[PDB]
């Protein structure tokens, strides 16, 4: 029953490393060492463990625990890995109606550029995203089931 159902979630769970699972194709957001960003279905991949943190209320950094690179979106709406934290690394984390998270570029919030992953596992471009695609829906998951 609802009373019997068990599921971790201790205090401080928000600071443990997470995987950003995209329901679109079922890929985990990945930040490669060379700075490129894409998705992968390999849960054992060492570049999908991310550390999220609120730099300002509702504004987060998404960092690769493996390389220390920060997720970021350039003026063209392209995702890339940044070695140092900057204004293009901040995203507005919000929970949508169906309880998935969306991450919008703070820098380009007015244009509604989201972090997104296509079914083929490649990163979506900011200008090509919009409130309705499955490509922008994410679920932060524990590193291991």
């Amino acid at each position: 029953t609802a009373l019997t159902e068990k599921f971790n979630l201790p205090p401080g769970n928000y600071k443990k490393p997470k995987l950003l699972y995209c329901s679109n194709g079922g890929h985990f957001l990945r930040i490669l060492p060379d700075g490129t960003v894409d998705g992968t279905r390999d849960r054992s991949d060492q570049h999908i463990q991310l550390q999220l943190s609120a730099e300002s209320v509702g504004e987060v950094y998404i960092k690769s625990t493996e390389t220390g690179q920060y997720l970021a979106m350039d003026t063209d709406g392209l995702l890339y890995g940044s070695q140092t934290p900057n204004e293009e690394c901040l995203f507005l984390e919000r929970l949508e109606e169906n309880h998935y998270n969306t991450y919008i570029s703070k820098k380009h919030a007015e244009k509604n550029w989201f972090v997104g992953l296509k079914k083929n596992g490649s990163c979506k471009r900011g200008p090509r995203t919009h409130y309705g695609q499955k490509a922008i829906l994410f679920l932060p998951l524990p590193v291991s089931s």
Partner: protein
């Protein structure tokens, strides 16, 4: 006349289905064959019975699908579709992960920060424990004086942020005070906020003479 085959594997390339608890999950295995093959679903390698989950589940032969509404944590597991006719049988297994999501302001653990007492020159710490889905922002605040007063003409107390979450801050959940003075005594507040709302709890620091 032929053994079963898949009609649309594209809709089967997803190796992990992670869904928010309370949402509906749908699995499909478009099949073909002659005679028309029959479909059956297994959970963790065994017959999936309606009584295995409250509210049971529904199947749609027209779509070769299995549907489970209002998923709960215990729904996690492997779901195998078995398609077969007299000439053969084929199958595919999907894995389901369920995660509890919550759109709520932060929740603080009762009792923290806890009061603390030390002597002049001593060190102390205050701990704050938070439950928050949306990333939380923590700040430690002290109720301070200004011109000898602790409140302004508008009734607002004078406050001072001692520290807050950020990449330039180590251990946001813990406020550590060193080589304390009687001037450090007072109320220390942990205020935690996410885009949905905030919560706060405080503790009192008592500073005794060195004697």
């Amino acid at each position: 006349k032929r053994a079963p085959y898949w009609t649309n594997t594209e809709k089967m390339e997803k190796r992990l289905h992670a869904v928010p608890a309370a949402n509906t999950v749908k699995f499909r295995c478009p099949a073909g064959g002659n005679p028309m093959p029959t479909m059956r679903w297994l959970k963790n390698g065994k017959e999936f019975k309606q009584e295995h989950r409250i509210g049971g589940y529904k199947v749609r032969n027209q779509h070769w699908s299995l549907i489970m509404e209002s998923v709960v944590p215990s729904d996690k597991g492997n779901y195998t579709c078995v398609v077969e006719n007299e000439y053969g049988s084929i199958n595919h297994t999907y894995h389901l992960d369920v995660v509890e999501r919550s759109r709520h302001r932060p929740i603080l653990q009762a009792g923290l920060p806890a009061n603390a007492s030390t002597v002049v020159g001593g060190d102390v710490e205050f701990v704050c424990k938070v439950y928050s889905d949306a990333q939380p922002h923590i700040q430690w605040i002290k109720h301070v004086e200004k011109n000898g007063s602790k409140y302004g003409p508008d009734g607002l107390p004078y406050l001072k942020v001692l520290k807050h979450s950020g990449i330039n801050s180590s251990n946001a959940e813990v406020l550590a005070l060193f080589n304390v003075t009687e001037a450090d005594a007072g109320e220390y507040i942990c205020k935690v906020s996410n885009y949905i709302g905030q919560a706060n709890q405080s503790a009192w620091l008592t500073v005794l003479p060195k004697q």
